[PDB]
């Protein structure tokens, strides 16, 4: 398929499954579907409002975070081992079925 499944759990504990395309960031999908993941700095790696926690399995599939993301993540509330900036995790076909939780 061209659709890539993304499972979202919101801070309220709601669970949503949506499909994205290659290139779509988790932040885009969030906005596209009224998941309340704010993107203060609009993808410029200058905030932490797009912080999401990805499942461990798909986490290792990802291009690891660059230095600007890592550093910014240190201001993110609720940081975990598999935390990422949602605007920096972009969908690929091998990431199908990825789970993101919004702290
Ligand atoms: S929107 Fe600010 S870092 Fe992703």
UniProtKB/Swiss-Prot annotation:
Domain called 2Fe-2S ferredoxin-type: residue spans: 1-103
Residue span of region Mitochondrial ferredoxin yah1-like: 1-103
Stated family: In the N-terminal section; belongs to the COX15/CtaA family. Type 2 subfamily.
Protein name: Heme A synthase-mitochondrial ferredoxin fusion protein
Source organism: Schizosaccharomyces pombe (strain 972 / ATCC 24843) (Fission yeast)
Chain residues that bind [2Fe-2S] cluster: 41, 47, 50, 87
UniProt gene name: etp1
Domain of life per record: Eukaryota
Post-translational modification comment from the UniProt entry: The etp1 preprotein is cleaved into 2 chains after imort into mitochondria. The N-terminal chain containing a heme A synthase cox15-like domain etp1(cd) is a subunit of the membrane-embedded cytochrome c oxidase complex and functions in the respiratory chain. The C-terminal chain containing a ferredoxin yah1-like domain etp1(fd) is released and serves in the matrix as electron transfer protein.
Positions spanned in the full protein: 516 to 603 of 616
